[PDB]
Amino acid sequence: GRYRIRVATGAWLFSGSYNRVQLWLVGTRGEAELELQLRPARGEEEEFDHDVAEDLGLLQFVRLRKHHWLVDDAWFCDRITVQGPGACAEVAFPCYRWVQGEDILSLPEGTARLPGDNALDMFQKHREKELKDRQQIYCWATWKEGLPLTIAADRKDDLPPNMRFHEEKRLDFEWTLKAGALEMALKRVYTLLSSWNCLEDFDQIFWGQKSALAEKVRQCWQDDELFSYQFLNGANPMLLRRSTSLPSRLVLPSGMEELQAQLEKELQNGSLFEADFILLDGIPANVIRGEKQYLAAPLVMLKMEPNGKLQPMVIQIQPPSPSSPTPTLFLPSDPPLAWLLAKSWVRNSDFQLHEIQYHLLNTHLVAEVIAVATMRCLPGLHPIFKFLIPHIRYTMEINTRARTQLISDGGIFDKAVSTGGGGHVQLLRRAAAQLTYCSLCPPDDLADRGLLGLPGALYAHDALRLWEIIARYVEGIVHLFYQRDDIVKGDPELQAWCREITEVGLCQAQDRGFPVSFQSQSQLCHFLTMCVFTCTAQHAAINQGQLDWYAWVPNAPCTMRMPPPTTKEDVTMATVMGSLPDVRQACLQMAISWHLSRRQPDMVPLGHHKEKYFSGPKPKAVLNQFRTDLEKLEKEITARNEQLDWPYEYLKPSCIENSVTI
Template sequence: MGVYRVRVSTGSSLCAGSNNPVQLWLVGQHGEAALGTRLWPSRGKETEFKVDVSEYLGPLLFVKMRKRHLLQDDAWFCNWVSVQGPGASGDEFRFPCYRWVKGDGVLSLAEGTGCTLVDDLQGLFKKHREEELEERRKLYRWGNWKDGLILNVAAASISDLPIDERFLEDKKIDFEASLAKGLAELAVKDSLNILACWKELDDFSRIFWCGQSKLAGKVRESWQEDAFFGYQFLNGANPMLLRRSSQLPARLVFPPGMEELQAQLEKELQGGTLFEADFSLLDGIKANVILCSQQHLAAPLVMLKLQPDGQLLPMVIQLQLPCTGSPTPPLFLPTDPPMVWLLAKCWVRSSDFQVHELNSHLLRGHLMAEVIAVATMRCLPSIHPIFKLLIPHLRYTMEINVRARTGLVSDMGVFDQVVSSGGGGHVELLRRAGANLTYRSFCPPEDLADRGLLGVKSSFYAQDALRLWEVIYCYVEGIVSLHYKMDEAVKEDLELQSWCREITEIGLQGAQDQGFPISLQSRDQLCHFVTMCIFTCTGQHSSVHMGQLDWYSWVPNAPCTMRLPPPTTKDATLETVMATLPNFHQASLQMSITWQLGRRQPVMVALGQHEEEYFGGPEPKAVLNKFRKELAALDKEIEIRNAKLDLPYEYLRPSLVENSVAI
C-alpha cells in the first residue's frame, strides 16, 4: 500500500527505443499490482513515474512487463527497472534486464540480489528459474561445426543467433565499415603491384602502409635479428608455446660432426637456461592448394638459450621430424650463411602463425569462450550470482565466432584463400589441438609452472598473466564469499553443478580426462574454475589477440603461407627466400585482415569497466569497486615498467584488455 516510484532505463543504441507501449506489474511476496500502460520507451532515456498501489505487496520479487503492438512489433532494449517503495525511507529494488524485449509476451525480471537454489528456501524464484532455463535451452542449442571439435552454439549464420547475442548497431557498423575499408585497401594494393617484380625483402614495404602500429615499424626494422626472433616466444603474439627444457627432445637427431652443438645444448640444459618451441602439432598436416599452386607446411623445433641479460637466442632449428627410412633432417644454425639461417627462421615464424591463429587464438580463446557462454546460458538463470558475475565477459562472443566460422575458416574463407594450413588442414589441426586441451594450461599459475616460465624476468607475459589472474581471482572470491558461506553450499547448488558438467562433459566433449572438473566441491575449487572462465574470456584472449597488428603486419616476420617446400640443404639464396614467402596478393590480404582484427577497437569495454549492473545491493558493488581499484593499480605498475623498456608489453594491461571475446 502506498505510492511507488518507478524508473525505467532504455539502452542508448540506435534502435533501443520503441514506439510500442509497455505495461508493468509489480510482484511482491504478498501480492501483485498492475500498473497499467505507463511507458513509451525512448532511446537513451530514463522514464520515471509514480503510482499509487492499494494492495500490500511486501518485499518486491519481480517486475513483469509486456510490450503491446497493433501493427508492428518494435523491439525495445531495456537496461533495468528500479522501484522505490512507499514513504521517504522506502527500500529501492533494482531489476536488471539488459536485453531486447520483443513480441507481446510477458517478461519477468527478478530482483537483482543474486540468489542460489540453496538460498531460495521458500522457493520464491523456483518457477521463474525453471521457466527461464527451459526457454533458454530452446534458444541456445549446442552445435557441431566440424566433427571432432569442441562444441559451439547452433547457428549457421548471424540471423540464427538469439537476438541478445548479436552486435548492437554501433559495434556492427564499425565492424562492417572496417571490413569494407580493408577490402578497399586490398584492391588498391593489388592494382598497384600486379605488374611489379618483387625481388628484395624490402619490396614488402610497397604494401606496408595505412593503419600500422608503432611496434609494427620496429618489427620491419629488426625482424631478422636473432634476439628479436627469440623475444617473440616470450612476449610476442603467441607466448603459449615456449617451455624450459627438462631434457633434449627425442626428435633432435644430431648428424655426424655436430658433437660440439650437442655439448653446448647439454651445458645450457644443466644450467636451466635451455628452452624449446616445438611445432610437432603441424607434423603431417596436409598443406593447402591455392589457385592450383601447392603450398607447404613444416613442423619445426627451435632450441633457445636464455642469456643473463634476459635475451632469448636461438641455438638450432630443425624444420621437420626425423622419419624412418629418410635422411636425417638438417639442423640449421646461426653460423650458417645468412640467407640459409633467415629462411629457417621464416619457416619457424610461418609455423608459429599457423599454431597461434588456430590453436592459441581461435581454439583456446574464441571457441573455449563460446563453450563457457553457451553452457552459462543453458544452465544458470539470470538470478544466479555466477551468471551475474560471468555475463559481462560473454558479450558478443557468439556473433564474432559465427562470423569467424562463416568468413575466416569456412570453405573458401580467408584460410582457404591465403593460409598454408587452409583447405582442410586447419580443421585437422584444431582436432589435434582440441584433444590436448588441459585444465592446467588455461590457468596461468599452473601453466607457467609447467612450462618453467615462473621467475623468467624477461617474460612480461608471464609476469602480467600471473598478476592479472590474482586480481581476477580476488574479485571472484569476493563475490563467491557473499553467496557461499561454506563448501557445502557449493556442493548443494545443483544449477552450479549442472553448469560445470555441461562445460566439461558436453561443450568440451568429455574433457575430464584432461583435468577439467565435472563437479565443484569447495569454494576454492569454484573460485579457481570461475577465474579460469573470466581470464580465458579477457586476459588470455587479449594476450594472443592484440599482438596481431604489431607482429603480423610485416609479412616476412609471420608469413601466412610458404610457396616452396622446407629446405633440406644449406644453399638458399635471396631468390629462394622471396620465392618461398607469400606473393604480394597473399601478403596484402594478410595485412588487411590483420589490420581489421588487430586494430584497437573504438567500440570496446575494458576489463571490469562494464556499465551493466547485474547485481543489486551494496556488497557486490563494493567488491566490483575493489576489483576496479586493483586493476587500475596493476595498470599503473605496467605503465611504469613499460616506460623503461625498448619494447613495451601492453597486451595484458587492464585498460587495454577487452572485457569479453568481442573481436
C-alpha cells in the same frame, strides 16, 4: 503508496513517437498493473510515478509486455529500478536483453540467489522456467567432429537476439569490412605490376593496416634477438617451454658436437628453452589459387642469456621421418638466407599454432563453450551468471562470424593461411587433445612450461599479476554466495553448468583435467578464474599482438609457397621470396591481423561493464576492488613499458577487452 519506477533503455528502434509497455509490479502479497509510455533518450532514464492502493509488500518481480507494437519495433531494456514507499532503497530489476514478442517477460529481483529445495518459491519456479526457455534458445552444435561444440547458429541471423551485436559494434564491423576491402584493392592495384623478388618489396604493402610496433618489427625482424623475443612477449607467448631434457626429435648428425656440447651446457644450466611445433606434423597444407602451400613442424632450441634475452641455438624445420632420419639443423652461423628462411619457417609455423590453437581454440572456442553453458545452465538469478554475463558478451556472434567468414570451407583462412583448406580443422582436433585445464591457467601453464620468475617474460609476469587480480575478484564474488563447500556441492545449477562445459561443451574433457563437478569453493574459484582469464586476459594477450607482429609479413608468414629447405647453400633470395607469401596472401594477412587486433571503439575494458546485474552493495564493492587492482596493474605495466624499447602492451587492463568480441 507512491512507487518511483525508473526504466533504463540501452537501445531502441521506434517508428512512432512513443511506445506503450504494460508493467506489473509483482510483490510478495500482490501485483499491480501499469501502463508506461516509452520516450527514451540516450544518456538518461525515464522516470514513472504510480500510486497504488493495495499493499504489494517486498517487491520480487517486475513483468513486462509490449502493448500493440509494430514488428520492426525493438526495445533493449537495460534495467528497472523501483523506489518503494518510504525511506527504503530502490529495488533493482536488471533486464539487459531485447524484449521479444508479445509474451510476458518476467524480470526477477536483482539480488543474486542460489537455488533451494523450496519448489513453491517464486524465484525457484522462475529460474526453472527460465532454464527451460534458455535451453530451447541456446543449443549446442557440432561445427566439426572432435572439436568443442558451438552455439546452434549456421549464420549470425540464426543467433539468439541477446547474443547479437549492438548498433555501434555492428556498424563498426561493417565499416572495417569496407576499410579492409578498400586497402586491399588499392594494394592490389599498387603491386599489380611490381616484381616480388626481394624483402624490400613488402614495403610496397606495409602501410595503412599497421602499428608503431610493426614499424619497429620491420626494421629488426632479421635480428635473432627479436625472433627469440616473440616466444616470450610476441603475439604467441604460449608455446615456449623450458627444456627439462633434449627433445627426442632433435637428432644431431656427426660433426655437430659443438652444438651438442652447447645444448647440454644450457640444459644443465636450466637456461635451455624450446618451442616445439610438433602439432603441425602431417597436417595437410593449403592449396591457394592452385598453388601448393607447404607446412613444417619445426623445433627451435633457445638459450637464456644472463642479460635476460633469449638467443636461438638451432632450428630443425622438419621432424625426423623414415625417409629422412636426420633433418637439417639450422644455426645462426649458417649462410644468412638459409638461417633467415629457417627463422621464417619457425615464425610461419608460429603463426599456425597461434591463430588456430592459442587464439581460435584456446580463447574463442573455449569462451563460446563458457558462453553457451552459462546461458543454458545458469539462470538470471544465479550469481555465477551475473558474474559471467559481461565476460561472454559478443562471443557467440564473433565465433559464428568466424565460422561463417573466416574458418569456413572456402573462407578467408583458406585464401591466405597454409593450414587452410581442411588442415586447420585437423590441427584443431590435435590442439583440442592438448587443450588441458592446466594450459588455460597461467599459474599451471607457466609452471608446466617453466616460465615462472623469468624477468624478460613480460607476458608471464602480467598474466600471473592478472590471475591474482581476477582470482581476488572471483573469490570476492564466490564467497559472498558460497560460504561453505557443501553449498558449492549443493548447487544443482552450478554442477549442471560445470558438466555442460566439461562433458558437453568441451566434449568430455575430464581426461584433460577439466572438472566434472565442483567439490569446494576453491575448485569453483579456480575454474571461474580460468573462465574470466580466457575470455578477457588470455584473449587480449593472444589477439592484440596480431597487428604488431604480423603486419610485417616476413616477420611471420601466413603461408609458405615453397618446401622447407634441406640444403643451406642452395637457399637464395629467390628461395626466400619464393617461400614467403605472394602479395595477395600478404595483403590478406595484414588486413585480417588489423581487423582482429584493432581496438574496438565500443570495447568494454576489463571489469568496466556498465551493466549492473548484481544489486547488493557487496558485489559492487568487489567489482570496484577489481577496477582498483587493475588500475594499480595499469600503472605498473605503464611504468615498466616506459623503460623498455620493446614494450608489452597487450595485458594493460585498459586495453584488455571485457570479453572475446573480435
